[PDB]
Amino acid sequence: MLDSKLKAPVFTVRTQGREYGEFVLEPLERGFGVTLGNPLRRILLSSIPGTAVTSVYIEDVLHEFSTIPGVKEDVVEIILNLKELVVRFLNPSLQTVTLLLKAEGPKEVKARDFLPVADVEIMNPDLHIATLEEGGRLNMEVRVDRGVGYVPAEKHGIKDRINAIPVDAVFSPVRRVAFQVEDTRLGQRTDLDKLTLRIWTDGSVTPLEALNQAVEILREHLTYFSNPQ
Amino acid sequence: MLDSKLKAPVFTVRTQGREYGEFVLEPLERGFGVTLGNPLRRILLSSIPGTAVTSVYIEDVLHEFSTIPGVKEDVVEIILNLKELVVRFLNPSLQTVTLLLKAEGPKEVKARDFLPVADVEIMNPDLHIATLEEGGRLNMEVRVDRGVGYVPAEKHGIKDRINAIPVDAVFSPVRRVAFQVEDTRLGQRTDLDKLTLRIWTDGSVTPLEALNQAVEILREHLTYFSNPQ
Amino acid sequence: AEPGIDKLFGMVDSKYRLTVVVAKRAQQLLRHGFKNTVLEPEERPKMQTLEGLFDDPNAVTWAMKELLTGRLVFGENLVPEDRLQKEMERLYPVE
Amino acid sequence: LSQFKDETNPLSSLRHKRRISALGPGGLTRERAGFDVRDVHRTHYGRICPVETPEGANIGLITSLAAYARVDELGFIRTPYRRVVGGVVTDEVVYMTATEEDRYTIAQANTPLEGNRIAAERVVARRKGEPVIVSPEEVEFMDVSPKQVFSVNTNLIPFLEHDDANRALMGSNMQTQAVPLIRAQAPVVMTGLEERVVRDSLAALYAEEDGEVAKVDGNRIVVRYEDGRLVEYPLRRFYRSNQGTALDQRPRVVVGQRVRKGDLLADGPASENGFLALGQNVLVAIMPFDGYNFEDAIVISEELLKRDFYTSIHIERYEIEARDTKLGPERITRDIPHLSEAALRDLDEEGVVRIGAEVKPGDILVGRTSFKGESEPTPEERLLRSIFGEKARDVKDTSLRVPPGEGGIVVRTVRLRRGDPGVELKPGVREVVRVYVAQKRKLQVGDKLANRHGNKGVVAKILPVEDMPHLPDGTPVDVILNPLGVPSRMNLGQILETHLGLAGYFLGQRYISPIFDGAKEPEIKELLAQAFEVYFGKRKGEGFGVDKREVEVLRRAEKLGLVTPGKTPEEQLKELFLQGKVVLYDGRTGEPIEGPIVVGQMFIMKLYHMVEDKMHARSTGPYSLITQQPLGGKAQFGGQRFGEMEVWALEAYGAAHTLQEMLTLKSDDIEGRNAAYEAII
Amino acid sequence: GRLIPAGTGSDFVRFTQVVDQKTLKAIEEARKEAVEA
Amino acid sequence: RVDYSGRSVIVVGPQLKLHQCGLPKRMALELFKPFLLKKMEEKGIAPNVKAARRMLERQRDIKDEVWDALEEVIHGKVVLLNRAPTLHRLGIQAFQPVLVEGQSIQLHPLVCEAFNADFDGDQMAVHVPLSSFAQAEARIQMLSAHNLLSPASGEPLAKPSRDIILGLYYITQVRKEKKGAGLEFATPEEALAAHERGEVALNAPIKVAGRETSVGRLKYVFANPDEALLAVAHGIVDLQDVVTVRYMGKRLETSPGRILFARIVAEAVEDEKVAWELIQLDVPQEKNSLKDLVYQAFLRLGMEKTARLLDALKYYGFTFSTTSGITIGIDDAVIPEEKKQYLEEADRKLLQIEQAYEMGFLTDRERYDQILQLWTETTEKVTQAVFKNFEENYPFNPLYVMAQSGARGNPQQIRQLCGLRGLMQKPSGETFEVPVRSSFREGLTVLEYFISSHGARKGGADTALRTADSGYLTRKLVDVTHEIVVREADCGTTNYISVPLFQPDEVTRSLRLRKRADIEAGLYGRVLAREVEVLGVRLEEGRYLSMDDVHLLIKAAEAGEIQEVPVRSPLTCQTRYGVCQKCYGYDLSMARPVSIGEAVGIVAAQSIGEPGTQLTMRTFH
Numbered sequence A, B: 001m002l003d004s005k006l007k008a009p010v011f012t013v014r015t016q017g018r019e020y021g022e023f024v025l026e027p028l029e030r031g032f033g034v035t036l037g038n039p040l041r042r043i044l045l046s047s048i049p050g051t052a053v054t055s056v057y058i059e060d061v062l063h064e065f066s067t068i069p070g071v072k073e074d075v076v077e078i079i080l081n082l083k084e085l086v087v088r089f090l091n092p093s094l095q096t097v098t099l100l101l102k103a104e105g106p107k108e109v110k111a112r113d114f115l116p117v118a119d120v121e122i123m124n125p126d127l128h129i130a131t132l133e134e135g136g137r138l139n140m141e142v143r144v145d146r147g148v149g150y151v152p153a154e155k156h157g158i159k160d161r162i163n164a165i166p167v168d169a170v171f172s173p174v175r176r177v178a179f180q181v182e183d184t185r186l187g188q189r190t191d192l193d194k195l196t197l198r199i200w201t202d203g204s205v206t207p208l209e210a211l212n213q214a215v216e217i218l219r220e221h222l223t224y225f226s227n228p229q
Numbered sequence C: 001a002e003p004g005i006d007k008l009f010g011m012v013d014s015k016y017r018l019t020v021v022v023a024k025r026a027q028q029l030l031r032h033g034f035k036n037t038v039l040e041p042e043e044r045p046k047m048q049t050l051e052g053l054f055d056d057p058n059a060v061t062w063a064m065k066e067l068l069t070g071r072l073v074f075g076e077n078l079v080p081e082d083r084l085q086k087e088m089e090r091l092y093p094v095e
Numbered sequence D: 001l002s003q004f005k006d007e008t009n010p011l012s013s014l015r016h017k018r019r020i021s022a023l024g025p026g027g028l029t030r031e032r033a034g035f036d037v038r039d040v041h042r043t044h045y046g047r048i049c050p051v052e053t054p055e056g057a058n059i060g061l062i063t064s065l066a067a068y069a070r071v072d073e074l075g076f077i078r079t080p081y082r083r084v085v086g087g088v089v090t091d092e093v094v095y096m097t098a099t100e101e102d103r104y105t106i107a108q109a110n111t112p113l114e115g116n117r118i119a120a121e122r123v124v125a126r127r128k129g130e131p132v133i134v135s136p137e138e139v140e141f142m143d144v145s146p147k148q149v150f151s152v153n154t155n156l157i158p159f160l161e162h163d164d165a166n167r168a169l170m171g172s173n174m175q176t177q178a179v180p181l182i183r184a185q186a187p188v189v190m191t192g193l194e195e196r197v198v199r200d201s202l203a204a205l206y207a208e209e210d211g212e213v214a215k216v217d218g219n220r221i222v223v224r225y226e227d228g229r230l231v232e233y234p235l236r237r238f239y240r241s242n243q244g245t246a247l248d249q250r251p252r253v254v255v256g257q258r259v260r261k262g263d264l265l266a267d268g269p270a271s272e273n274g275f276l277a278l279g280q281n282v283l284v285a286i287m288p289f290d291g292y293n294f295e296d297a298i299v300i301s302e303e304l305l306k307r308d309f310y311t312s313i314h315i316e317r318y319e320i321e322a323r324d325t326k327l328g329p330e331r332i333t334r335d336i337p338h339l340s341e342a343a344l345r346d347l348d349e350e351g352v353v354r355i356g357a358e359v360k361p362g363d364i365l366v367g368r369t370s371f372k373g374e375s376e377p378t379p380e381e382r383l384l385r386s387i388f389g390e391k392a393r394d395v396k397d398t399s400l401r402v403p404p405g406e407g408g409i410v411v412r413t414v415r416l417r418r419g420d421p422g423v424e425l426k427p428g429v430r431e432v433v434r435v436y437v438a439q440k441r442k443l444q445v446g447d448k449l450a451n452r453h454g455n456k457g458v459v460a461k462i463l464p465v466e467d468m469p470h471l472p473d474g475t476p477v478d479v480i481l482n483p484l485g486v487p488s489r490m491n492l493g494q495i496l497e498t499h500l501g502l503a504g505y506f507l508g509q510r511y512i513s514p515i516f517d518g519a520k521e522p523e524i525k526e527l528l529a530q531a532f533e534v535y536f537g538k539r540k541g542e543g544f545g546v547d548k549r550e551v552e553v554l555r556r557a558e559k560l561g562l563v564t565p566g567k568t569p570e571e572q573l574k575e576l577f578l579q580g581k582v583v584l585y586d587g588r589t590g591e592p593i594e595g596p597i598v599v600g601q602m603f604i605m606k607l608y609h610m611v612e613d614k615m616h617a618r619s620t621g622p623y624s625l626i627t628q629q630p631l632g633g634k635a636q637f638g639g640q641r642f643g644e645m646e647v648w649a650l651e652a653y654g655a656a657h658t659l660q661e662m663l664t665l666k667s668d669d670i671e672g673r674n675a676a677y678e679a680i681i
Numbered sequence E: 001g002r003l004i005p006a007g008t009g010s011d012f013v014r015f016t017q018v019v020d021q022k023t024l025k026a027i028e029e030a031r032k033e034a035v036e037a
Numbered sequence F: 001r002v003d004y005s006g007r008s009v010i011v012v013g014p015q016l017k018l019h020q021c022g023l024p025k026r027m028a029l030e031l032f033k034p035f036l037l038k039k040m041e042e043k044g045i046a047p048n049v050k051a052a053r054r055m056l057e058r059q060r061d062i063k064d065e066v067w068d069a070l071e072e073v074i075h076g077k078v079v080l081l082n083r084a085p086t087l088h089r090l091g092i093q094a095f096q097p098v099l100v101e102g103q104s105i106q107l108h109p110l111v112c113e114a115f116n117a118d119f120d121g122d123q124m125a126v127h128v129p130l131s132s133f134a135q136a137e138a139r140i141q142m143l144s145a146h147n148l149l150s151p152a153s154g155e156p157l158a159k160p161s162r163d164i165i166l167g168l169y170y171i172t173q174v175r176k177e178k179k180g181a182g183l184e185f186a187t188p189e190e191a192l193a194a195h196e197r198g199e200v201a202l203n204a205p206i207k208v209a210g211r212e213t214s215v216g217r218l219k220y221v222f223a224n225p226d227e228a229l230l231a232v233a234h235g236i237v238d239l240q241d242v243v244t245v246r247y248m249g250k251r252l253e254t255s256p257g258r259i260l261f262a263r264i265v266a267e268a269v270e271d272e273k274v275a276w277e278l279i280q281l282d283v284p285q286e287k288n289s290l291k292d293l294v295y296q297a298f299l300r301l302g303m304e305k306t307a308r309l310l311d312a313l314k315y316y317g318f319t320f321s322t323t324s325g326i327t328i329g330i331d332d333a334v335i336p337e338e339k340k341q342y343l344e345e346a347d348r349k350l351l352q353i354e355q356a357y358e359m360g361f362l363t364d365r366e367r368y369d370q371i372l373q374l375w376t377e378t379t380e381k382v383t384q385a386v387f388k389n390f391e392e393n394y395p396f397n398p399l400y401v402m403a404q405s406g407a408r409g410n411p412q413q414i415r416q417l418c419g420l421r422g423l424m425q426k427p428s429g430e431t432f433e434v435p436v437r438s439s440f441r442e443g444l445t446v447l448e449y450f451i452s453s454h455g456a457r458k459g460g461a462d463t464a465l466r467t468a469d470s471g472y473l474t475r476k477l478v479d480v481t482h483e484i485v486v487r488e489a490d491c492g493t494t495n496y497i498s499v500p501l502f503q504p505d506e507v508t509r510s511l512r513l514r515k516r517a518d519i520e521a522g523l524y525g526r527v528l529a530r531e532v533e534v535l536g537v538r539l540e541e542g543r544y545l546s547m548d549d550v551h552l553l554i555k556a557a558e559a560g561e562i563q564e565v566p567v568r569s570p571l572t573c574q575t576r577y578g579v580c581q582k583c584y585g586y587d588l589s590m591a592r593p594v595s596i597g598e599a600v601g602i603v604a605a606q607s608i609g610e611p612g613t614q615l616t617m618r619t620f621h
């Protein structure tokens, strides 16, 4: 095509990893970049799904407020550290994955000390779980799940092992959205909108993936205007 | 379908003419009515095309602030009345149509006094242009165009006839948009968005038609995210 | 606020009369049975879990809605004290 | 005079440790007299804070002492003062009694000084209680520090200097209600005593002499000094405070580590790193939201809850005794006579509840059994029992259950039988059974947080990070404070903190602005200047410039008068930023908020929930024996008082019956309340 | 604990009554019945 | 202590309507427990009454069907709410519960004024009307939205508070910018053109002191109402800008914002022309302009219709408030340069007084009393200085608009931040010789602080002691006044009082009109004892004089036709225990004649006990 349709939003991308991804789209008539960027941002933060530690089981610990010997970090600190652990499974078949880990003695436990699982990957290997001095026992079972949004430990409640303790759910993969609308120059008319939205991601999903899901949630929503009544 | 998909946006409509039309749609998860209503509004006012008086030429008048004898209404009132005139052409071939009109003597000039044009129709016939007493001269050339949004007479600038005067652009057939997001109650979870956006229209197009156009402009724009670079 | 409150206020000679009337009217609306009302027809009391206010939600909301119409009559001494309860029992059944 | 220690948080106890009350022996000052005693006297200087007194009837009579103020051997609050000889200032400090202080011409510390020299001809001093502009030749003595003027508790306020002494009191008392948060943070801006408060208080655990660390348990740090000796330092893991706040000593030193003599080995209940910490520094936009912050409401960002930011652990001991009745001892067993084993689950050990069990309102914490009626209880109910199924165990279910309001998880239990340890049980008391329970209190809409200045308020809405005010670069604001609450009250110091904070955020630094000598407007506009480069500098390099929005707000900024017309937007925004306000977009619309709005790192603490907090709600319940009026009980809440003032309220209206109700059916009409209930039923 | 002398407890309105036209006709049908033989 | 009660922390319920209030469902449950039990039975949830009870004894056992039940029970019922010190009848209002989740109780913003309640933790109690009668009265005459006008003054209490004004204000105020070259459009046609281009250039603003039209009016002319705001949306005209628009009849030169306000009300109550009649779009809308709006809306349109407008104002005010971007900032408290001069001017003026005393002219005392008037004048000088500054250079200062708007701010308060707070008194009462030169913006130093502290406690202790005496004053006034109640027929004893419109001795003897307010206090809603023919109208005998009538009588006395007014009053009533309709007047909480049976005795006693807390209390005698 040549005149009005060829002059179409040039979708340009700049993605350096799974965490940052810029997205420019440039001739947009008047106050459209805003009309676009804003909803997408709103979607990008509330609707995209992901993973988070939903339950924990220390083998000799019974309640969450327990202090484990040999371990400098109390259960509440550890369960907290786990909240910051980011995992990624590759397919639906993996709804709830239980990661396992046990380290004894003098070593600093990290996220990579978890025994590998076939379709699961830990993007957060060097995260710090704990510091064990000697005669340091640590045998835990941490359940991971795929959901959306924020879910207080009090809302779900886990049922793996009777002595296990639930943890708060931190699901969105998107860390922050940002979109800029700066003018662009086109031959005869100067008033032009240029939308370039920057998306950041924990790594679970990718900026591009996120954005794509986003736009679909919008589209799907625009279809719900079909049957009057 | 029965559970998550049957619980789908019930699109309900209340339209009682071509000018006012309510549109309700509930249940929407969290902060979505806003994510939807806002863009649609932005589109509903800028994007939907229309027709407005872009230029006028009184044959003996030179400036906009002129007072014409025999005519009770000054140029500024008449050019104002013309802004209220709503026309409708049937096809793209009609970009800029010049409507013509001349009435002499004792009659009250109305929009219907304009000589008919093949593909153009005046929906505002009984609108009041002026009151001519006797020896009342009135020969005017009013240019009509099709565009979008609001364009100050100062922004475009007429080039029909050297003594002609520009008029402010009243284009979007939509006169005003309004969307309310009030909570709704669904069984278990109370947090719910309910979007009901009210659209007003000059009559050219209808609220329903407007909205539909709107949603498509959004969709079309969502597709421009296809070819990376 | 609440439906034609002004219209209501205007019907009585005293504010505190509109309170006595409605309250006593709601009383009997329950006692003799609930269909004692004068307005079941085309448009009357409604609620949405299902529209069923047609049976027994708020007595008082009814009393007001009826009083707002011109069917009821509230006097200082309209009908002999004890004899009413007797004839109302006779005519309005599910007690 | 001796009262429950108030350990809501260490600072608190410290204060309650040193507050001077009027009332007492009775010989000194009963409550009758007061207005002459209640006021602040010229001598109260450096001797008693003029701010610490309690809001309320009991005002000016009960008060904590000052910073350096100390009791000479016989109770005369005296205080330190340097010796200035001629126009020369010295360090020899004299702890001067209240009386001798009047004999000399004393000067304030604020006096320009080069070392030992006094620098301005006309410079302030105060003879005896009266401000006097004296010459460098008459300055006999000088004030030690601005600090000695107030109390510890007050000295913790950043720019006390710009805050109305009236609402600074509020600030002082508020910290006394600070609740220890699992995540404790020190203020972005501190005065300087945070450090010594936790040390003089005994919050953190410091190191005696130098040495190295042997073992670092979650329960013990056995350090080994260079002297050839090593000691095990236990750490009060989770201990209950008289008031119910967690006192846990949590390590901060790694295995095999150098230790400075007097260096933090473990942090106290509320210290981050040897520093006093109550509450957390949070980025805050200072504007109006819908109505969510209308008279004194606070709007909070859900994101604050995502992180485990405002969260605090609580603990309460439920007790129950096995009593010896003449009808038969109250057995304490797992046996709960009448209906289900489902309830007995967590009653794991036969009798008591199992540790780590989730106890919700109405679960058996402990079980006991007493006998009822004499041998023959109910003639009618005995029939029913023979009929349906004779399951006769005459003992009654008197068991300590979870009172409405809530419990959490059981973390500790104590069972003291009749008395063989070294415990003396009260007479009649067969045995006691305590049950400590703990719970996490997340920040929620009912809670109340307040900065040190005095801005007090309650969370009205927890907004989705989705739509609250967000800055140009995607970082949104956590809490939205309403401006209007600032003019009436007079504490710009909070607006000064927020500014210095904005800098600290982009400059990744924290500062210490002393009481009256601290930061000064030019220095702060300066740090903001440095900030602009980190905030907008990166923006330049990262690839983009200014928004249509950003320019738009500049348009409504120059028309306002915040930016010098004619300059460039990058130069205009620097100007705008130096003023402390930046451009903010809605978040719920993307459009900008017409006009720059200030934002920044303001420190905000969360306040302790009294037993009142427990939202009471009562249908029907117990009643009093002699006066039969609704009475609060074990499993029912207890009624609210309808007082005179409230009677008249209804009396004023034509509420005839509603008032009768309040006096009959609802409270005293014995036959009334009964036929009332049933009728309703 | 008696009703308030002022308000609805007004002797002016304590005593008031409400009747449906349906019970209006009913009450005088009672009066019509008063006619003996 | 009442059986169906409960209390929790309150929290602002912005969306909530006057009508309702947010009540925690968990609370609704044991509140309306018996009422729920049977509807439980009326639906399959439970077989019976004891069943339903054990079904709810625990928390985890509640099926979500039960909520559905409770919500259904509470359908048209209302509860009463009560704040800490109940001081007047409104200290207890009724509302429709809208069950919500959480601990806190959602309270409407507009009624927050009636109950003195801020959201710093104040907890409100809640009761339940059990008889059908009790509720009848509760929602008919005790619901919130029905009592909008105060029993103390016929002036609204549902007056847009702190934020709503701030908002509704910003939107309606117009702006002015630069007069460089000529402002003469009124006459030349070359003036319209030249200053239209010059404005296009950089010399003439859109808002210029041109007497008939600043080029801002010249450039833009809007046909229909909507047209005006569309241009606004598109970024052509801001709301506060001066433009020209066409309404029902004439070309009205009015800003966008003011035109929108019009619609807000016009819509609130649809009687668009009746909406224009009672509003003044000729000015920014202060709390008073609004207070007046409410009042007349109440008298003309009707009670509930008023309620509507109230929330309508509430909603847009709050909204437009957020967008306006008003915010405090250290740099916003502007210090007038003039301060340095006024200071320095009074500075040397002090040197002279000291130069006078140093000689032996002025007595120990004379000096003192002379220095004090020096400051007391100099201080008041800086105060008109700061304001004039804002007035002429920053019309839209954040700090200042709240103050000039019905919103938060006190002239003597602004003085402590921008200007300076200077004279603080000694312990006794003898003010200090030396003022506090600093402001709050800059470091109130170490000493100036201490100096100011003394006066603090005397005020704090005053509030505590008067706080209980406001209770003192009331008890005593209700002990005497409780029996007084409106019971009547126009008491026939016509003995009346005459309300003066002129005061004798302010200055020895000169007759002058009493204060507007005061006069209103005397004649509002009174019953004329005898007929009075005044400016052309014939006030009828016995007629209740509306505020509008009390406004005519004043204009009349202004003219010189009346010096007193014949009016029936409680002071002269016949009815031994009680007062009659004609003698009391108007003011029920309603602006109509008083309704027979109102407990006037107390209503009075209260209106005088509350304000009492504001009056100073040093020593009784």
Ligand SMILES: [Mg+2]
Binding pocket: F117, F118, F119, F120, F121, F122
């Ligand atoms: Mg308060």
Ligand SMILES: [Zn+2]
Binding pocket: F490, F491, F572, F573, F574, F575, F579, F580, F581, F582, F583, F584
């Ligand atoms: Zn009388």
